[PDB]
Amino acid sequence: PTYTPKAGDTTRSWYVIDASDVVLGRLASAAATLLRGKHKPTFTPNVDGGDFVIVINADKIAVSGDKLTKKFAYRHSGYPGGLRKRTIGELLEKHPTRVVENAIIGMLPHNKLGRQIQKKLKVYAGPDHPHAAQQPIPFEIKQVAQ
Amino acid sequence: AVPKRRMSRANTRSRRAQWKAEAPGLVTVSVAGQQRKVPRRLLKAARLGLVDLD
Amino acid sequence: ARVKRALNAQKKRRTVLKASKGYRGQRSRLYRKAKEQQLHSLTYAYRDRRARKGEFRKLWISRINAAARANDITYNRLIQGLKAAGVEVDRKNLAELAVSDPAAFTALVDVARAALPEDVNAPS
Amino acid sequence: TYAIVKTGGKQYKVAAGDVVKVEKLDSEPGASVSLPVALVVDGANVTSKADDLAKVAVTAEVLEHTKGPKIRIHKFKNKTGYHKRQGHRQQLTVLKVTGI
RNA sequence: UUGUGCGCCGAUAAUGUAGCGGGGCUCAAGCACACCGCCGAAGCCGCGGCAGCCAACGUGUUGGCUGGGUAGGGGAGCGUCCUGCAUCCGGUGAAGCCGCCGAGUGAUCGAGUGGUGGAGGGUGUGGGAGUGAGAAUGCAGGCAUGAGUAGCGAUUAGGCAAGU
RNA sequence: GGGGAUAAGCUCCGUGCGUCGAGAGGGAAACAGCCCAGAUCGCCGGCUAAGGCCCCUAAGCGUGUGCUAAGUGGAAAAGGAU
RNA sequence: UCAAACUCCGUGAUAGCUGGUUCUCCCCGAAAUGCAUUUAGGUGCAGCGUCGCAUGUUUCUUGCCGGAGGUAGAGCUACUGG
RNA sequence: GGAGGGGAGUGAAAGAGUACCUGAAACCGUGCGCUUACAAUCCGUCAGAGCCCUCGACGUGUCGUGGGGUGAUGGCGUGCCU
């Protein structure tokens, strides 16, 4: 029959993506693909055999058009008139990592397995991270030519 | 108001498990020599021979 | 002759109730609810036997795409090249090769790249 | 070494001594049959050309004729009164691969 | 200026973004025109089983077409009980009931088995039906849910000591 | 085509027109009546239809030549507009 | 219990109305139209299903040929009306 | 205190004790195995990790033409009748 991963089959690696001057959607899609494990031939939608992804320089990320001051991030508290909106500009200047986190999280499945996969994403607004002990592998967003 | 639906067994049992009794705590005492258990609230009364021990 | 209904009814009731072991709540205890759930279960099984072939083909295609992009080639170009080269391995065994024998998958990728045209966008 | 043999409209990855369930073949148990091959993987080199695959065949011995799992079908459409019960057990043969 | 391809205001309601399905996209993941692939259904093909109609040759095989379906029409069957006849089983344990292991295209089956039980059953071939329920705000009996919940029936009131 | 204010998810007729009714499967987010296609059963085989191929989500952040700045794409008129 | 009490009987009153009608599989497979109707949510006959018998392609599709129209279009000192 | 029960006896049987043949279902417990307290579930179905039990083969655990129980997790999925 088709191969199925067992208890100790999944092996995880660490990647770091430098978000400097990278389109938000492009980086978010690449990071979602890495987190889901779609790049591994042993992929199984049942299992979270993905990899740990580190994103540094989250505040340097590139947003095209006028989406910096015309795209809103919304949230409702649950109380009447509890709708709050911030543009990408102030959201970046206050919580730089939140833009990248929101974008990536919106691109992976909304099941419980997606909640588990979220745990393997670390984003940092600075150029450095505290995960040097894991020796992350630098990652470049390339496109396979056809 | 009346119940619109019949309870499932899980909900009925989960609510019903909260109707229970707690075990009173017991301490030892010496009345007429023999040791026996008594609630601490009645220790003084037992020592004064005011509580019937069967 | 007056006929009592017990034996004839108990037969099918036992069959349905035995088939419904493991269900939750009324669906495993009462014959009527178990019978409704059995109707739904057999409809579901019939639909899912048909859908299972497509589900497994989708999983195989996902694995083949991953292993092909690991060899710097896309799934669609790889399938076109394999068809051009005349090799007749289906997606099930292609995914099996991708997981179990990566060297064989790389060799097949090489032959598929060889069989491809020189300009894939040419009006050929 | 192993090969991918075709039988009954399907392909199976088999090695020597493998036991594989397969669609019904008109052969008695204890007999031997030869099957075409879609790919041969011996060690490192991979045989994929049509002519080389035609020059090779996989020989297997019929172990027994068995039956598949029982399948219960009960077609149903609500608010119609339509039901249709049906059963099915597929016929199969068990082949043990002798060599490639 | 003339026609044109895309664009701009016009544009504008009351739970919450809310007139891309979401993330997001102009570094197009937008549009137009050409080109090349692939995905994609119970469609078609491959391999195996079954059935209806017809054909050929035969004394049942092969082949060709066909096999969604309500109202409804036609055909063939499963299970229940009582019985004529004929056979077989049974206190060395029938029926009924509860399991295990299997079986048939279906209703279903198990002269396969284990436990319980204590007196009648099976099979073949005919005869006859009070012959099959899931629902009629159906009927009788038993039992759930609400739930250890409401209430424990006035407008006077009980207490202590001793006894049993 | 008639009635109604050629307004209605209004009503009444014609149509070897379709589908649903009595039709599952795929697509249109969901979606009796729209598009593809008519389910005898099994398969962990292949090719396609409509519709698609950045991630959710299977398959192209496909190739070549141009356009758009409006997030137009991803709702609307008379009319207005270096 | 009262715009004609209650009980039993006629009696299993009668309802073009409402509800219900119990095992399986195989083959085929509709209609929601016309006419009449104290008629319009009913029914009769016809239309459409199925089964049997009889008859054979008479059915259907495409090409060609022979026919009659007064629609679309157009036209009007060719008529009648505005 | 009784009711009731435990030994002991009767009985072929007390899984025949005057609540008594057989003793089904709903309903109510007790014990063991698996699972379950970040999760939006017509409660199933298709894949399926892990754990437990069982049948075979070879060693000491490790596969198999295996079988059962439970199922984290993913896909699909709008109760029956009228």
Query: For helices C75-85 and C102-115, what crossing angle results, to 10°?
Result: 70
Phi, psi angle pair for A5, to nearest 5° = -65, 145
The torsion angle over the Cα atoms of residues B2, B5, B10 and B11, rounded to 10 degrees, is -30
Q: Does residue A28 sit in helix, strand or coil?
A: helix
Amino acid at A69: T
- Give the resolution value in Å: 2.7
Does strand G come within 7 Å of the CB of D79? no
Does strand G come within 7 Å of the CB of D83? yes
User: Which residues on A lie below 8 Å from C99 (Cβ)?
Assistant: 3, 41-42
Distances from the Cα of C92 to the Cα of A1, A102, C64, D16, D83, angstroms: 9, 37, 9, 20, 36
Selection from D22, D2, D4, D1 nearest residue D12 by Cα? D4
- Is C96 exposed, middle or buried, given 0-12, 13-18 or 19+ CB atoms closer than 10 A? buried
Kindly determine whether residue C96 and residue A42, on different chains, have CB atoms separated by under 8 Å.
Answer: no
Determination technique for this PDB entry? cryo-EM
Pairing type for strands A52-56 and A14-18 reads: parallel
Selection from A67, A51, A69, A62 nearest residue A13 by Cα? A51
Answer yes or no: are the C-beta atoms of D28 and D62 closer than 8 Å: yes
Strand E: which bases are under 7 Å from protein Cβ?
15-17, 22-27, 29, 34-42, 46-49, 69-71, 79-82, 96-100, 103-109, 128-134, 144-149
Kindly determine whether residue C87 and residue D73, on different chains, have CB atoms separated by under 8 Å.
Answer: no
Amino acid at A5: P
Strand partners, A138: A16
> What is the DSSP track for A51-81?
-EEEEE-GGG-B--TTHHHH-EEEEE-SSTT
Looking at the complex, report in whole angstroms how far the Cα of residue C81 sits from the nearest Cα belonging to chain B: 58
Name the one residue in this structure whose structure tokens are 């998958």: C105
The structural domain count of chain A equals 1
Q: Which two tokens stand for residue C118?
A: 């020189």
Q: Which two tokens stand for residue C20?
A: 């419904």
Optimal mutation site among B9, B12, B14, interface C, most CBs of chain C within 10 A? B9
Buried b (16+ CB within 10 A) or exposed e, D34-73: ebebbbbbeeeebbbeeeebeeeebebbbeeeeeeeeeee
Neighbours of chain A (3+ CB pairs under 8 A): C
D 2-21: CB within 7 Å of strand F:
8-11
Answer yes or no: are the C-beta atoms of D83 and D74 closer than 8 Å: yes
Q: Which H or E element spans position A96?
A: helix A96-105
- Domain around A62: 1-146
Does strand F come within 7 Å of the CB of D23? yes
Give the distance between the most distant pair of CA atoms in chain C: 88
Selection from A72, A30, A128 nearest residue C69 by Cα? A30
Q: D79 CA to G23 C1', in Å?
A: 20
Strand G: which bases are under 7 Å from protein Cβ?
24-26
Name the one residue in this structure whose structure tokens are 């090695």: D15
> What is the DSSP track for chain C?
-----HHHHHHHHHHHHHHTTT--GGGGT-HHHHHHHHHHHHHHHHHHHHHHHHHHHHHHHHHHHHHHHTTT--HHHHHHHHHHHT----HHHHHHHHHH-HHHHHHHHHHHHHHS-S-TTS--
Strand H: which bases are under 7 Å from protein Cβ?
25-29, 38-40, 42-51, 64-66, 69-77, 79-82
Answer yes or no: are the C-beta atoms of A95 and A111 closer than 8 Å: no
Instruction: Quickly count: other Cβ atoms within 10 Å of residue C72's Cβ.
Output: 11
